[PDB]
Amino acid sequence: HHHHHMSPNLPGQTTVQVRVPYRVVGLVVGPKGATIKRIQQQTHTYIVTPSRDKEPVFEVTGMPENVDRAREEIEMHIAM
């Protein structure tokens, strides 16, 4: 993207990919991004939301234990 850049993570932090069904990206983001903002604050992670018509993949950055916690909150927003 012309308006984004790659930055190295803080020491000890990793970045993983969390794939969701395309229909539930809006559920994870929530109204005005309140849901995805709550996940970042509660899990102490940095999460990039995928674009409009791109791969429904969230990029979660943080400590490995915190990144795993953020992955579960994202995957819980998926109906069976």
Residue 31 sits in a domain whose CATH number is: 3.30.1370.10
For 2, 3, 15, 56, the CA distances from 18, given in Å and listed in that order, are 23, 22, 10, 8
> Looking at the 3D structure of the chain, how many domains does it have?
1
Kindly state whether residue 39 falls inside one of the protein's structural domains.
yes
Do the Cβ atoms of 70 and 63 come closer than 8 Å? no
DSSP state of 53: S
Resolution, Å (one decimal): 2.5
Residue 6 lies in a domain: no
| 44 found inside a domain | yes
Tell me which residue of 62, 68, 69, 60 sits closest to 17, measured CA to CA.
60
Structure-solving method: X-ray
**Residue 37 in domain:** yes
Classify residue 52: in a domain, yes or no: yes
Domain that holds residue 18: 13-80
Residue 7 lies in a domain: no
CB-based contact 35:77 (threshold 8 Å): yes
The answer as to whether 70 is a domain residue is yes
- H/E segment holding residue 80: none
